[PDB]
Scaffold this active site. Structure first.
Site, PDB file in Angstrom:
ATOM      1  N   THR A   1      -0.095 -12.843  -5.019  1.00 52.70           N
ATOM      2  CA  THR A   1       0.368 -12.426  -6.335  1.00 52.70           C
ATOM      3  C   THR A   1       1.715 -11.783  -6.181  1.00 52.70           C
TER       4      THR A   1
ATOM      5  N   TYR B   1      27.264 -20.696 -37.437  1.00 57.17           N
ATOM      6  CA  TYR B   1      25.907 -20.141 -37.434  1.00 57.17           C
ATOM      7  C   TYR B   1      25.675 -18.899 -38.276  1.00 57.17           C
TER       8      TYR B   1
ATOM      9  N   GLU C   1      25.992 -12.552 -28.255  1.00 52.92           N
ATOM     10  CA  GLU C   1      26.152 -13.700 -29.126  1.00 52.92           C
ATOM     11  C   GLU C   1      25.131 -13.625 -30.276  1.00 52.92           C
TER      12      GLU C   1
ATOM     13  N   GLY D   1       0.807  -1.218   0.000  1.00 50.98           N
ATOM     14  CA  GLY D   1       0.000   0.000   0.000  1.00 50.98           C
ATOM     15  C   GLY D   1       0.845   1.275   0.000  1.00 50.98           C
TER      16      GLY D   1
ATOM     17  N   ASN E   1      20.355 -20.952 -24.886  1.00 54.90           N
ATOM     18  CA  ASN E   1      19.675 -21.236 -26.164  1.00 54.90           C
ATOM     19  C   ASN E   1      18.180 -20.859 -26.122  1.00 54.90           C
TER      20      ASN E   1
ATOM     21  N   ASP F   1      23.406 -29.343 -23.796  1.00 56.26           N
ATOM     22  CA  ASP F   1      24.084 -29.331 -22.506  1.00 56.26           C
ATOM     23  C   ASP F   1      23.174 -28.585 -21.527  1.00 56.26           C
TER      24      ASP F   1
ATOM     25  N   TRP G   1      32.679 -18.494 -26.509  1.00 53.15           N
ATOM     26  CA  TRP G   1      33.218 -19.221 -27.656  1.00 53.15           C
ATOM     27  C   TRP G   1      34.752 -19.263 -27.669  1.00 53.15           C
TER      28      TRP G   1
ATOM     29  N   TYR H   1      26.514 -33.175 -17.901  1.00 58.05           N
ATOM     30  CA  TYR H   1      27.881 -33.664 -17.673  1.00 58.05           C
ATOM     31  C   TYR H   1      28.023 -34.085 -16.229  1.00 58.05           C
TER      32      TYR H   1
ATOM     33  N   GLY I   1      -6.760  -7.989   4.230  1.00 52.90           N
ATOM     34  CA  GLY I   1      -5.856  -6.941   4.702  1.00 52.90           C
ATOM     35  C   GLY I   1      -6.556  -5.828   5.482  1.00 52.90           C
TER      36      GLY I   1
ATOM     37  N   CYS J   1      24.883 -26.637 -32.669  1.00 49.56           N
ATOM     38  CA  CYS J   1      24.085 -27.353 -31.660  1.00 49.56           C
ATOM     39  C   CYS J   1      22.610 -27.061 -31.875  1.00 49.56           C
ATOM     40  N   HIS J   2      22.291 -25.796 -32.107  1.00 48.83           N
ATOM     41  CA  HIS J   2      20.982 -25.333 -32.562  1.00 48.83           C
ATOM     42  C   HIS J   2      21.014 -25.254 -34.116  1.00 48.83           C
TER      43      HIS J   2
ATOM     44  N   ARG K   1      20.309 -30.345 -31.698  1.00 54.22           N
ATOM     45  CA  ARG K   1      20.780 -31.713 -31.802  1.00 54.22           C
ATOM     46  C   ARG K   1      21.445 -32.237 -30.526  1.00 54.22           C
ATOM     47  N   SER K   2      22.004 -31.319 -29.756  1.00 58.19           N
ATOM     48  CA  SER K   2      22.856 -31.656 -28.636  1.00 58.19           C
ATOM     49  C   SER K   2      22.692 -30.543 -27.642  1.00 58.19           C
TER      50      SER K   2
HETATM   51  N1  LIG Z   1      -1.866  -5.283  -2.275  1.00 59.31           N
HETATM   52  C1  LIG Z   1      -2.743  -5.810  -1.530  1.00 59.31           C
HETATM   53  O1  LIG Z   1      -3.029  -6.983  -1.581  1.00 59.31           O
HETATM   54  C2  LIG Z   1      -3.420  -5.003  -0.454  1.00 59.31           C
HETATM   55  C3  LIG Z   1      -4.342  -5.611   0.371  1.00 59.31           C
HETATM   56  C4  LIG Z   1      -4.946  -4.850   1.367  1.00 59.31           C
HETATM   57  C5  LIG Z   1      -4.599  -3.524   1.522  1.00 59.31           C
HETATM   58  N2  LIG Z   1      -3.708  -2.966   0.712  1.00 59.31           N
HETATM   59  C6  LIG Z   1      -3.333  -1.581   0.929  1.00 59.31           C
HETATM   60  O2  LIG Z   1      -2.995  -1.488   2.312  1.00 59.31           O
HETATM   61  C7  LIG Z   1      -3.354  -0.190   2.820  1.00 59.31           C
HETATM   62  C8  LIG Z   1      -4.350  -0.354   3.962  1.00 59.31           C
HETATM   63  O3  LIG Z   1      -3.828  -1.252   4.950  1.00 59.31           O
HETATM   64  P1  LIG Z   1      -3.379  -0.706   6.410  1.00 59.31           P
HETATM   65  O4  LIG Z   1      -2.544  -1.785   7.053  1.00 59.31           O
HETATM   66  O5  LIG Z   1      -2.860   0.703   6.273  1.00 59.31           O
HETATM   67  O6  LIG Z   1      -4.802  -0.612   7.181  1.00 59.31           O
HETATM   68  P2  LIG Z   1      -5.923  -1.702   7.564  1.00 59.31           P
HETATM   69  O7  LIG Z   1      -5.359  -2.845   8.353  1.00 59.31           O
HETATM   70  O8  LIG Z   1      -6.802  -1.923   6.351  1.00 59.31           O
HETATM   71  O9  LIG Z   1      -6.808  -0.743   8.518  1.00 59.31           O
HETATM   72  C9  LIG Z   1      -6.334  -0.482   9.837  1.00 59.31           C
HETATM   73  C10 LIG Z   1      -7.532  -0.106  10.681  1.00 59.31           C
HETATM   74  O10 LIG Z   1      -8.378  -1.245  10.900  1.00 59.31           O
HETATM   75  C11 LIG Z   1      -8.717  -1.327  12.289  1.00 59.31           C
HETATM   76  N3  LIG Z   1      -7.964  -2.464  12.864  1.00 59.31           N
HETATM   77  C12 LIG Z   1      -8.201  -3.743  12.543  1.00 59.31           C
HETATM   78  N4  LIG Z   1      -7.347  -4.540  13.210  1.00 59.31           N
HETATM   79  C13 LIG Z   1      -6.564  -3.749  13.955  1.00 59.31           C
HETATM   80  C14 LIG Z   1      -5.529  -4.021  14.828  1.00 59.31           C
HETATM   81  N5  LIG Z   1      -5.141  -5.299  15.058  1.00 59.31           N
HETATM   82  N6  LIG Z   1      -4.913  -3.001  15.439  1.00 59.31           N
HETATM   83  C15 LIG Z   1      -5.300  -1.740  15.218  1.00 59.31           C
HETATM   84  N7  LIG Z   1      -6.297  -1.452  14.374  1.00 59.31           N
HETATM   85  C16 LIG Z   1      -6.948  -2.438  13.732  1.00 59.31           C
HETATM   86  C17 LIG Z   1      -8.314   0.021  12.859  1.00 59.31           C
HETATM   87  O11 LIG Z   1      -9.330   0.961  12.558  1.00 59.31           O
HETATM   88  P3  LIG Z   1      -9.802   1.978  13.709  1.00 59.31           P
HETATM   89  O12 LIG Z   1      -8.698   2.989  13.622  1.00 59.31           O
HETATM   90  O13 LIG Z   1     -11.148   2.383  13.167  1.00 59.31           O
HETATM   91  O14 LIG Z   1      -9.814   1.089  14.933  1.00 59.31           O
HETATM   92  C18 LIG Z   1      -7.114   0.410  12.045  1.00 59.31           C
HETATM   93  O15 LIG Z   1      -6.871   1.818  12.016  1.00 59.31           O
HETATM   94  C19 LIG Z   1      -3.936   0.566   1.642  1.00 59.31           C
HETATM   95  O16 LIG Z   1      -2.904   1.356   1.034  1.00 59.31           O
HETATM   96  C20 LIG Z   1      -4.403  -0.537   0.707  1.00 59.31           C
HETATM   97  O17 LIG Z   1      -4.443  -0.084  -0.645  1.00 59.31           O
HETATM   98  C21 LIG Z   1      -3.101  -3.678  -0.253  1.00 59.31           C
HETATM   99  C1  LIG Z   2      30.180 -29.236 -23.473  1.00 54.06           C
HETATM  100  C2  LIG Z   2      29.758 -27.865 -23.952  1.00 54.06           C
HETATM  101  N1  LIG Z   2      28.614 -27.364 -23.487  1.00 54.06           N
HETATM  102  C3  LIG Z   2      28.141 -26.183 -23.893  1.00 54.06           C
HETATM  103  O1  LIG Z   2      26.976 -25.772 -23.426  1.00 54.06           O
HETATM  104  C4  LIG Z   2      28.963 -25.371 -24.812  1.00 54.06           C
HETATM  105  C5  LIG Z   2      28.608 -24.080 -25.196  1.00 54.06           C
HETATM  106  C6  LIG Z   2      29.418 -23.366 -26.069  1.00 54.06           C
HETATM  107  C7  LIG Z   2      29.032 -21.950 -26.479  1.00 54.06           C
HETATM  108  N2  LIG Z   2      27.761 -21.616 -25.811  1.00 54.06           N
HETATM  109  C8  LIG Z   2      26.758 -20.982 -26.697  1.00 54.06           C
HETATM  110  C9  LIG Z   2      27.814 -21.177 -24.394  1.00 54.06           C
HETATM  111  C10 LIG Z   2      26.669 -20.778 -23.752  1.00 54.06           C
HETATM  112  C11 LIG Z   2      26.858 -20.520 -22.399  1.00 54.06           C
HETATM  113  C12 LIG Z   2      28.157 -20.790 -21.951  1.00 54.06           C
HETATM  114  C13 LIG Z   2      28.795 -20.630 -20.629  1.00 54.06           C
HETATM  115  O2  LIG Z   2      29.992 -20.919 -20.443  1.00 54.06           O
HETATM  116  N3  LIG Z   2      28.003 -20.152 -19.677  1.00 54.06           N
HETATM  117  C14 LIG Z   2      28.406 -19.938 -18.307  1.00 54.06           C
HETATM  118  C15 LIG Z   2      29.045 -18.538 -18.082  1.00 54.06           C
HETATM  119  C16 LIG Z   2      28.426 -17.408 -18.930  1.00 54.06           C
HETATM  120  C17 LIG Z   2      29.183 -16.074 -18.962  1.00 54.06           C
HETATM  121  O3  LIG Z   2      29.669 -15.692 -17.875  1.00 54.06           O
HETATM  122  O4  LIG Z   2      29.242 -15.392 -20.056  1.00 54.06           O
HETATM  123  C18 LIG Z   2      27.224 -20.145 -17.396  1.00 54.06           C
HETATM  124  O5  LIG Z   2      26.051 -20.082 -17.837  1.00 54.06           O
HETATM  125  O6  LIG Z   2      27.455 -20.377 -16.202  1.00 54.06           O
HETATM  126  S1  LIG Z   2      29.116 -21.371 -23.255  1.00 54.06           S
HETATM  127  C19 LIG Z   2      30.618 -23.931 -26.517  1.00 54.06           C
HETATM  128  C20 LIG Z   2      31.013 -25.216 -26.120  1.00 54.06           C
HETATM  129  C21 LIG Z   2      30.220 -25.959 -25.261  1.00 54.06           C
HETATM  130  N4  LIG Z   2      30.553 -27.196 -24.833  1.00 54.06           N
HETATM  131  C1  LIG Z   3      -4.394 -10.845  -5.047  1.00 53.53           C
HETATM  132  C2  LIG Z   3      -4.875  -9.543  -4.468  1.00 53.53           C
HETATM  133  N1  LIG Z   3      -4.690  -8.417  -5.191  1.00 53.53           N
HETATM  134  C3  LIG Z   3      -5.105  -7.235  -4.781  1.00 53.53           C
HETATM  135  O1  LIG Z   3      -4.919  -6.113  -5.480  1.00 53.53           O
HETATM  136  C4  LIG Z   3      -5.774  -7.158  -3.468  1.00 53.53           C
HETATM  137  C5  LIG Z   3      -6.243  -5.961  -2.980  1.00 53.53           C
HETATM  138  C6  LIG Z   3      -6.853  -6.007  -1.746  1.00 53.53           C
HETATM  139  C7  LIG Z   3      -7.369  -4.732  -1.184  1.00 53.53           C
HETATM  140  N2  LIG Z   3      -8.847  -4.728  -1.211  1.00 53.53           N
HETATM  141  C8  LIG Z   3      -9.483  -5.802  -0.418  1.00 53.53           C
HETATM  142  C9  LIG Z   3      -9.459  -4.505  -2.519  1.00 53.53           C
HETATM  143  C10 LIG Z   3     -10.576  -5.179  -3.044  1.00 53.53           C
HETATM  144  C11 LIG Z   3     -10.938  -4.607  -4.251  1.00 53.53           C
HETATM  145  C12 LIG Z   3     -10.135  -3.522  -4.641  1.00 53.53           C
HETATM  146  C13 LIG Z   3     -10.217  -2.646  -5.851  1.00 53.53           C
HETATM  147  O2  LIG Z   3      -9.629  -1.561  -5.853  1.00 53.53           O
HETATM  148  N3  LIG Z   3     -11.046  -3.140  -6.811  1.00 53.53           N
HETATM  149  C14 LIG Z   3     -11.429  -2.622  -8.126  1.00 53.53           C
HETATM  150  C15 LIG Z   3     -11.874  -3.811  -9.005  1.00 53.53           C
HETATM  151  C16 LIG Z   3     -13.057  -4.648  -8.458  1.00 53.53           C
HETATM  152  C17 LIG Z   3     -12.830  -6.163  -8.482  1.00 53.53           C
HETATM  153  O3  LIG Z   3     -13.002  -6.779  -9.576  1.00 53.53           O
HETATM  154  O4  LIG Z   3     -12.510  -6.755  -7.416  1.00 53.53           O
HETATM  155  C18 LIG Z   3     -12.578  -1.634  -8.124  1.00 53.53           C
HETATM  156  O5  LIG Z   3     -13.517  -1.792  -7.307  1.00 53.53           O
HETATM  157  O6  LIG Z   3     -12.579  -0.703  -8.965  1.00 53.53           O
HETATM  158  S1  LIG Z   3      -8.894  -3.208  -3.470  1.00 53.53           S
HETATM  159  C19 LIG Z   3      -6.997  -7.182  -1.005  1.00 53.53           C
HETATM  160  C20 LIG Z   3      -6.564  -8.401  -1.473  1.00 53.53           C
HETATM  161  C21 LIG Z   3      -5.962  -8.425  -2.730  1.00 53.53           C
HETATM  162  N4  LIG Z   3      -5.491  -9.574  -3.259  1.00 53.53           N
END
Ligand SMILES: NC(=O)c1ccc[n+]([C@@H]2O[C@H](COP(=O)([O-])OP(=O)(O)OC[C@H]3O[C@@H](n4cnc5c(N)ncnc54)[C@H](OP(=O)(O)O)[C@@H]3O)[C@@H](O)[C@H]2O)c1
Ligand SMILES: Cc1nc(=O)c2cc(CN(C)c3ccc(C(=O)N[C@@H](CCC(=O)O)C(=O)O)s3)ccc2[nH]1
Ligand SMILES: Cc1nc(=O)c2cc(CN(C)c3ccc(C(=O)N[C@@H](CCC(=O)O)C(=O)O)s3)ccc2[nH]1
Ligand SMILES: NC(=O)c1ccc[n+]([C@@H]2O[C@H](COP(=O)([O-])OP(=O)(O)OC[C@H]3O[C@@H](n4cnc5c(N)ncnc54)[C@H](OP(=O)(O)O)[C@@H]3O)[C@@H](O)[C@H]2O)c1
Ligand SMILES: Cc1nc(=O)c2cc(CN(C)c3ccc(C(=O)N[C@@H](CCC(=O)O)C(=O)O)s3)ccc2[nH]1
Ligand SMILES: Cc1nc(=O)c2cc(CN(C)c3ccc(C(=O)N[C@@H](CCC(=O)O)C(=O)O)s3)ccc2[nH]1
Ligand SMILES: O=c1ccn([C@H]2C[C@H](O)[C@@H](COP(=O)(O)O)O2)c(=O)[nH]1
Ligand SMILES: O=c1ccn([C@H]2C[C@H](O)[C@@H](COP(=O)(O)O)O2)c(=O)[nH]1
Ligand SMILES: [Cl-]
Ligand SMILES: [Cl-]
Lengths: 503, 501
Positions: A142, A325, A277, A22, A416, A408, A299, A448, A122, A385-386, A405-406
């Site tokens: 997510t 190549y 490359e 947030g 690749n 590693d 190389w 290997y 949340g 190889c490719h 074809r080969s």
């Molecule tokens: N990305 C996501 O998935 C995601 C999900 C959720 C939220 N968000 C973001 O997170 C932000 C909101 O979250 P937030 O953490 O700021 O607020 P929040 O937890 O949504 O809200 C806090 C409020 O809830 C009440 N509350 C519930 N449990 C509490 C506890 N254990 N201790 C104290 N108060 C508690 C209190 O309200 P009172 O003050 O009324 O007591 C507190 O002020 C927003 O920016 C939102 O967009 C993002």
């Molecule tokens: C046995 C063998 N295996 C291969 O994969 C191979 C590759 C090339 C050329 N090839 C197209 C390569 C692709 C990636 C490489 C390599 O040494 N990678 C290391 C370090 C990369 C760097 O720091 O630039 C790695 O991925 O850890 S080498 C030449 C002879 C070979 N011989």
């Molecule tokens: C996976 C995940 N992604 C999120 O962005 C997320 C956000 C919240 C915060 N909160 C709980 C929200 C619920 C819905 C919101 C929102 O801004 N919705 C849009 C779209 C509606 C929908 O399809 O859900 C809107 O209302 O315009 S924000 C909680 C759990 C989450 N979980």
């Protein structure tokens, strides 16, 4: 107990990378309509059996007063659900129940207000109370891959929870995201086993990626499952490199490029090297110094004197990789001389031809760029190889399939997957198309033996949402892309995992 | 009379001519696998039931003659209550005996604790159980061959349907599978965590919708047909008949077990084999196929097609540098179908077969027909572009990339063709058979085939056939059509499907 009878509350929440939920009593990020549809569907579902017995039944949604104030007034009370607000300052809110604390409310609801399930929406006051006191057994969360300015934070989830579900990765033009389920840590019918025609008691696999994740819809599980499958069932085989590898044949992965960019998240992958490359391929280059000059060394070992001399390339200049190549993409059929020669107008420019054909004849079924030039294989430092890739257009979207074809799995494959994903996005842009799928075919897929510990570490790591790709929209011809025009946003990853190359 | 005598479960193994017995024995050579299926199916007790009573067993019931047909050393069948029906024997060691079925079922259910009752024949018993509706489920092993016999399984009434089909298996002497017949008469989080619409209209087309356990490999193909019809985009293409299209599939077939010649229509195997032999010999002359009564390439070599696509100086049926040329002569200068290319270009087939022998762990075992330099000279660029071999555990696998897949016409040929090729390469390399992995890029169904494929996807697959190659053949160029035999092919009728050019 104060909280007797107030457990099994389910949280929904959306959380930024920095834990912000947030900002100034609003959501901190631009509106993600998809995420709201997900909340709504999640909080309004009634199981069919329950709804047939009590057809008017609804779930309960509980929030703090500030969160209620943060919802647009026209959307309140939230439809098809019993809305409950907690407050010690307000007594009455239109269309809602109001309680002074959570324990009172849950008890009152479960004794006196018929309903199905209770959800916690949340804010942090409520989330904190619910988590601090063990009242929640499931969290629908997510995940956003970006930090946002904020003043309200989601509390830390205790280590008593684990992720059990991950959605595919999604994206808007401002963030990448997915949906997960956390739950507290604390069989198939016999005919299924019989009708396989094989042993009814099979040893279960030795390796399983992220074994606590039951719903496995992140695309990265395709890759992790492959790593676990090769470790579990692959055959240990010698190979050209002299380090043996576990191997299995034939896989097919797909990635929805409209939703995310498949850069692995289970280790930090070196994107800059992937992009350099690809640009090098596109310009047709066979000169490995062009990559070294840009601090990309992938190389390097295959252009070194000792590798060249070891494979019959005694007259080759160091890092002259031969007709690999990029030469095939732009000059298929031209006579390779060396990496310094002029090939302007020589051979067939497959990349140019295919991009033009996507524009002029998108329904063509020959949209192929082929690097397996049988006549040149002997001249290449390493054959490709490719090998082959093919485009496809339907409903104004570009897809691409690539044959590897080969594969590693530790080292090359991650590069690749990202590489062809970029290429596909580049071609779609210059052809004015949307993005379809990248389909990756693996032939000889292997790990290997010196990468087993690394891969074991990797497959236990829970994927983050994939990042997203933004290309500079002004770029209109594929040759004009520079590294600053290719940007990956919102990349969250686990740490890099050192993996040594065999060769 | 049969009050309380229902829900009996039949196990049986049946030959193609409905024969189950001959001279009071099994009519076919012993299939140990089939007996494991029987033993496993008839000895299973659910774990909840088994823990509540740990000594509990199922009942097996058979006629006197069936009991006498089982080796003495196996009797009574272990871990089951054995029940024989007879009006001439009163006592059999280790078994219960009754004079008729109704008596026995009633006595058992009232007085002999047990889990489930199985009917193990013979035809006197199966005929009584089926005539009187006492069976709700049939576990049946289907054999794809006729056997001499004197004892027959009765027709299964049309009140039953097949609800499960195992993969196809094979011995040296028959192909077979396991099926289940039964009488005709997703948690929310799974929906939510897709992230897409929770209400999802069912696909418009579903292959064999009564079959719930779908382990026959042919379901891969039928599922793809249904998927393209359900979700494919209708779009134009080169032919001027539009096609429903979807991109990217992967099928696999275990070539050790069976040969994937589709059973949901009769497939023209002879043409597949002649076409493959033509590829292998490197021919580009379409007359070589016409001379063998194989006309699959005929329209693509005709004057009218040649002249419309700019091949005005090509002889009729000179298809240019297509598949066989690329396999045997990649990089050679194509002149015409009458030229000598001996020793010209790269013989990829020969080179890769040798490498499988000398270095099977090589990762470049590729034959590529996408010769970018020659595409312009081909009457049609190759549909099956590229293929790659793989060796592990002394078994050969192959993966093939198909750029363009006419699911109605071409694809059934393409599957069988690479299956034969893989078997041929395995034989000449002294290897066993692994998997054929078929990658589909643009997979499509032409609009004029929709009726045909709708008919096809409702047909229940038979077990696949098996391939037997002449074991004396040592070199891939020595295979002739007489050396390539498909046995035990049971199929539904052919379905006519016209080519769009
Ligand atoms: N990305 C996501 O998935 C995601 C999900 C959720 C939220 N968000 C973001 O997170 C932000 C909101 O979250 P937030 O953490 O700021 O607020 P929040 O937890 O949504 O809200 C806090 C409020 O809830 C009440 N509350 C519930 N449990 C509490 C506890 N254990 N201790 C104290 N108060 C508690 C209190 O309200 P009172 O003050 O009324 O007591 C507190 O002020 C927003 O920016 C939102 O967009 C993002
Ligand atoms: C046995 C063998 N295996 C291969 O994969 C191979 C590759 C090339 C050329 N090839 C197209 C390569 C692709 C990636 C490489 C390599 O040494 N990678 C290391 C370090 C990369 C760097 O720091 O630039 C790695 O991925 O850890 S080498 C030449 C002879 C070979 N011989
Ligand atoms: C996976 C995940 N992604 C999120 O962005 C997320 C956000 C919240 C915060 N909160 C709980 C929200 C619920 C819905 C919101 C929102 O801004 N919705 C849009 C779209 C509606 C929908 O399809 O859900 C809107 O209302 O315009 S924000 C909680 C759990 C989450 N979980
Ligand atoms: N492939 C398979 O799955 C399978 C399965 C089973 C059997 N078989 C084969 O089938 C053959 C044997 O079958 P079958 O049909 O010849 O004989 P059957 O049914 O096994 O036995 C017939 C005899 O059993 C008694 N009987 C059967 N039903 C009875 C009933 N309702 N009431 C009283 N008595 C009953 C009678 O014995 P009395 O004359 O003593 O009264 C009758 O003569 C063998 O060749 C065997 O190998 C094959
Ligand atoms: C699916 C099926 N296949 C069968 O062959 C079959 C045979 C019977 C006939 N009868 C009910 C039999 C039970 C057991 C038999 C038998 O010949 N057993 C051999 C094989 C042992 C093994 O390989 O496991 C034996 O005991 O030596 S014959 C009944 C149901 C069936 N069901
Ligand atoms: C649009 C199109 N689709 C194809 O599948 C195709 C296939 C070939 C060559 N090909 C490789 C063929 C495989 C199978 C064929 C066919 O006509 N099959 C018929 C009749 C078979 C017969 O009796 O000989 C069938 O299966 O019903 S044709 C040439 C042009 C094409 N054009
Ligand atoms: O882009 C690339 C280039 C190479 N390889 C791997 C596969 C093999 O492990 C090795 C090449 O060895 P060969 O298959 O050619 O033996 O490099 C890749 O994975 N991707
Ligand atoms: O072995 C073959 C040869 C051709 N095709 C099909 C795919 C297309 O429907 C058509 C070739 O047309 P283009 O893709 O080249 O337009 O024939 C096959 O399925 N298999
Ligand atoms: Cl794009
Ligand atoms: Cl010409």
């Amino acid at each position: 107990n104060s909280y007797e009878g107030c457990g099994d509350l389910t949280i929904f929440v959306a959380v930024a990378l920095n834990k912000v939920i947030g900002h100034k009593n609003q959501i901190p990020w631009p509106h993600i309509t998809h995420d709201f549809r997900f909340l709504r569907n999640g909080t309004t579902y009634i199981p069919p059996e329950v709804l047939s017995k009590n057809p008017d039944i609804q779930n309960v949604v509980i929030f703090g007063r500030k969160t209620y104030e943060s919802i647009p007034k026209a959307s309140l009370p939230l439809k098809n659900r019993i809305n409950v607000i907690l407050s010690r300052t307000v007594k009455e809110v239109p269309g809602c129940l109001v309680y002074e604390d959570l324990s009172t409310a849950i008890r009152d609801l479960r004794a006196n207000v018929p309903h199905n399930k209770i959800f916690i929406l949340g804010g942090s006051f409520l989330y904190k109370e619910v988590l601090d006191n063990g009242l929640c057994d499931k969290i629908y969360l997510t995940r956003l891959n970006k930090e946002y300015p904020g003043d309200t934070y989601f509390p830390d989830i205790p280590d008593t929870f684990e992720i059990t579900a991950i959605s595919p990765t999604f994206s808007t033009d401002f963030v990448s995201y997915d949906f997960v389920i956390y739950e507290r840590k604390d069989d198939p019918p016999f005919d299924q086993l019989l009708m396989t025609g094989t042993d009814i008691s099979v040893p279960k696999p030795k390796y399983v990626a992220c074994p606590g994740v039951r719903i496995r819809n992140h695309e990265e599980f395709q890759y992790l499952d492959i790593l676990a499958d090769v470790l579990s069932h692959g055959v240990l085989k010698p190979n050209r490199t002299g380090t043996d590898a576990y191997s299995k044949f034939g896989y097919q992965m797909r990635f929805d490029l409209s939703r995310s960019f498949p850069l692995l998240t289970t280790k930090k992958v070196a994107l800059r090297s992937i992009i350099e490359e690809l640009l090098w391929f596109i310009k047709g280059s066979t000169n490995g110094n062009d990559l070294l000059a840009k601090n990309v060394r992938i190389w390097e070992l295959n252009g070194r004197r000792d590798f060249l001399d070891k494979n019959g390339f005694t007259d080759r200049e160091e890092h002259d990789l031969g007709p690999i190549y990029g030469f095939q993409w732009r000059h298929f059929g031209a006579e390779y001389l060396d990496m310094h020669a002029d090939y302007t107008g020589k051979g067939i420019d497959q990349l140019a031809e295919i991009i033009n054909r996507i524009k002029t004849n998108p329904n063509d079924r020959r949209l192929i760029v082929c690097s397996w030039n049988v006549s040149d294989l002997k001249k290449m430092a390493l054959p490709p190889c490719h090998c082959f890739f093919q485009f496809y257009v339907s409903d104004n979207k570009l897809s691409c399939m690539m044959h590897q074809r080969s594969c590693d799995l530790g080292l090359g494959v991650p590069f690749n997957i990202a590489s062809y994903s970029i290429l596909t996005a580049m071609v779609a842009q210059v052809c004015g198309l949307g993005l379809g799928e990248f389909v990756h075919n693996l032939a000889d897929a292997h790990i290997y033996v010196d990468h087993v510990d690394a891969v074991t570490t990797q497959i236990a790591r829970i994927p983050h949402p994939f990042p997203r790709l933004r290309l500079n929209p002004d770029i209109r011809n594929i040759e004009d892309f520079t590294i600053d025009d290719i940007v990956v946003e919102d990349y969250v990853s686990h740490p890099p995992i050192p993996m040594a190359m065999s060769a």
